[PDB]
Design an enzyme around this catalytic site. Structure first.
Site, PDB file in Angstrom:
ATOM      1  N   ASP A  52       0.940  -0.744   0.107  1.00  0.00           N
ATOM      2  CA  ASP A  52       0.151   0.236  -0.087  1.00  0.00           C
ATOM      3  C   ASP A  52       0.808   1.114  -0.171  1.00  0.00           C
ATOM      4  OD1 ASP A  52      -2.570   1.989   0.415  1.00  0.00           O
ATOM      5  OD2 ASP A  52      -3.399   0.201   1.269  1.00  0.00           O
TER       6      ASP A  52
ATOM      7  N   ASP B 195       4.048   2.650  -4.075  1.00  0.00           N
ATOM      8  CA  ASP B 195       3.336   2.661  -5.246  1.00  0.00           C
ATOM      9  C   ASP B 195       2.193   1.943  -6.683  1.00  0.00           C
ATOM     10  OD1 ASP B 195       1.112   4.543  -7.416  1.00  0.00           O
ATOM     11  OD2 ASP B 195       3.014   6.030  -7.149  1.00  0.00           O
ATOM     12  N   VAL B 196       0.972   1.049  -6.942  1.00  0.00           N
ATOM     13  CA  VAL B 196       0.889   0.836  -7.881  1.00  0.00           C
ATOM     14  C   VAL B 196       0.849   1.391  -9.076  1.00  0.00           C
ATOM     15  CG1 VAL B 196       0.101  -0.996  -6.509  1.00  0.00           C
ATOM     16  CG2 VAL B 196      -1.792   0.637  -7.470  1.00  0.00           C
TER      17      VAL B 196
ATOM     18  N   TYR C 130     -13.931   6.510 -11.364  1.00  0.00           N
ATOM     19  CA  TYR C 130     -13.668   5.090 -11.379  1.00  0.00           C
ATOM     20  C   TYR C 130     -14.970   4.043 -11.778  1.00  0.00           C
ATOM     21  CZ  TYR C 130     -14.003   1.674  -7.147  1.00  0.00           C
ATOM     22  OH  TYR C 130     -14.172   0.941  -6.918  1.00  0.00           O
TER      23      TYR C 130
ATOM     24  N   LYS D  53     -13.020   0.632 -13.747  1.00  0.00           N
ATOM     25  CA  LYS D  53     -13.385  -0.644 -13.170  1.00  0.00           C
ATOM     26  C   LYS D  53     -14.168  -1.118 -14.221  1.00  0.00           C
ATOM     27  CE  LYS D  53     -12.492  -0.815  -8.782  1.00  0.00           C
ATOM     28  NZ  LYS D  53     -11.588  -1.666  -8.589  1.00  0.00           N
TER      29      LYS D  53
END
Ligand code: MG
Ligand code: MG
Lengths: 226, 226, 225, 225
Positions: free
Chosen positions: B36, B46-47, B138, B142
């Site tokens: 995370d 940091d993805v 978002y 998604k």
């Protein structure tokens, strides 16, 4: 002529589906602005660049007084299975095929709200619905376009704006065996033609589709039916 | 204990669904790495940053010898209707919620192919399927996660890798009236709990789901059914 | 005038969507046969009765020579939550709204194969995709119509037949019940029968020449959320 | 042992998926009633016959006191492209695969409402979502099962009942026909009945406590492409 004096922006308008759609809108009396990376009024536009998109819409409005219809169609196909897809390739597809649709939608919607209404058609894909080997970034982008389309329909539907997606299968615009394999996935037994996608875009952009909002219209010969 | 000695990465693992899922994997005997932005082994990641994602997976493998399961769950919710959604906000959500899933999936898959198999669960959403007012970036992200999941399932399914998405409705983790309005959209008459999403993740990650591949499992009390 | 001399059957043609659709086809030059339980040539037909459906199609072909387009639209709305839905009410809805579509599609396809092509539009619904409180048999029927449409598109797509479904939201054809229905449609009103007709004519036209196996939602946004 | 003393009915229980599912529930401590046209308590039941379905549920409740879980799974596969699909074959598939699910669901829900809650798993299919050549009545039936499942989840979700569908791909239960079916499943094999059972037990369990109205595909990737 269903689009007499309507002001239309077609992005990715210099070739393929975009060119066929611009041509169809011109035939039906529209004032059309074609936007693309390179060569109806042509305006060079990188749809991934917010300032270029803003300038596109501003110039359209300065020239013609309004914007009635946006077809957000720019897109690249440059992909790979994930193990071969490098980050720059992923990002270029997301930038153009998804962020470019957000940008074009955003600034078209601002203009349309100021007028009290308008119509957007977004270019989705069969790959807004189903994946395919090697179609990694493009599927992700097109899935995003579908959902973006749906939220916009919900937010701006009540404000006299309709937002829908056209979702083409493979279109004749490659090795013979690769082509026959693609054909085999379409139950009608051929690939589509760009003008066939254009026809759907004009339907969705017209008052014939006056209660169509938030919808994906598959133009795919049956590809997603199986 | 269905996950004894399995090596699991949970991204977004420090709170909410990620924390519940990490806790459940630990309870079932797994070796878990939590990734995370800030505070089982914790690795700050940091993805959206490819080098940090690569380092996460490399460190996991150095510590535990392998990677069996990736839950790509990191995500932010920071959104608006498109007319209010600025470009930096859009991009931050796309970066974390979509590109971060691509990055985590890509480097997990490289590791899993080298082992001859593995399992990925991606965090989708009800908003992989339906839009909602104000849920712009978002939903787009998604929707992209859903399609990415499907293509990966097609490409890596034949290589003993399963890839599925969990798709939560709203989870209890706001004004009363805003909360009751959310509740009213879920036919079961309450919001979900994070542990309920965790339970689905563990199902999809387990051999109980051995022929489940490319699927979205809605955990939404009926939200998308209507 | 997209349908000059095209021969069309519209079932459920005496009212609402069927009526609007038949009128639209007539405007555009078609020869239209209207089929319904009771009152463009009108032929009284129970769509749940195979002999009646076969007779409808035979008489159309005898009169006009061929059958270009079938709009399989007959359908009842008389439903309930499952705990209140009697077996005979379930069965009546299945018989008319699902089996009726099978029968109309089956015998249309026989004619279309014989003559070398044709186009079918089935009447689906938003309830081909989403359920709703008290919409039990009708949702089952319409879910069935969607999948039937898909299989037909696959089998008959290669034989110069296209098969698609139009999927209306609620159409304006008890103020508080109406406002609740309206609140579920983001566009802020119920649809018009004429708007569904417009979609049918699109799907039936050569403008939809590569549209096959598709469901076209005409729902103001209902299913998008 | 997730189902200790839970009372379960499995229809179509004498073979394939139903058999595997009943065995799995027995392993996990359930009291299982198996229902099928012919041969855990076995009760011979025609699921298309409302009196038989009602008797099945009554006898389960009389024996074991309550009905916790219904797996409505009975179903036939005997189908054809529409031009070859006789009315009686269409009707038989609809009667068993769709109306049978309505009947099992209806009378399970009556019991579940009376006792204060319960869980239903309906057997859908990949053909609740996609068509296929020659899969006409079965796809219609399964599309119907999906929408029925959704409406039930909406009506009965607020009443402490969850309703979901398991959707299998092809399950291994003519080499060239088999290889063609296998080629449509990205995982490179057909499924096992036990793999569908595993999904049923998940959906029936408190691990799926917020899963309602959902279709869980168990298809190796079939529908993903
Ligand atoms: Mg498919
Ligand atoms: Mg909905």
């Amino acid at each position: 002529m269903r689009f007499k004096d309507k002001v239309v922006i077609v992005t990715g308008g210099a070739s393929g589906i975009g060119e066929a759609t611009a041509r169809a809108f011109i035939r039906e009396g529209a004032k059309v602005v074609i936007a693309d990376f390179s060569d109806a009024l042509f305006i060079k536009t990188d749809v991934a660049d917010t300032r270029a998109v803003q300038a596109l819409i501003a110039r359209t409005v300065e020239n013609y007084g309004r914007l009635d219809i946006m077809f957000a169609n720019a897109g690249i196909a440059a992909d790979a299975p994930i193990d071969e897809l490098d980050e720059a390739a992923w990002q270029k597809t997301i930038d153009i095929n998804l962020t470019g649709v957000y940008l074009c939608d955003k600034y078209a919607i601002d203009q349309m709200r100021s007028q009290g209404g308008g119509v957007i058609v977004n270019c989705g894909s069969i790959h807004s619905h189903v994946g395919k080997s090697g179609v990694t970034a493009y599927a992700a982008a097109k899935g995003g376009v579908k959902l973006l389309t749906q939220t916009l329909a919900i937010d701006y539907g009540p404000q006299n704006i309709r937002v829908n997606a056209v979702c083409p299968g493979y279109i004749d615009t490659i090795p013979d065996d690769k082509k026959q394999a693609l054909v085999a996935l379409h139950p009608m037994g051929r690939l589509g033609r760009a003008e066939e996608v254009a026809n759907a875009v004009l339907f969705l952009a017209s008052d014939e589709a006056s209660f169509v909002n938030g919808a994906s219209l598959l133009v795919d010969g049956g590809y997603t039916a199986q």
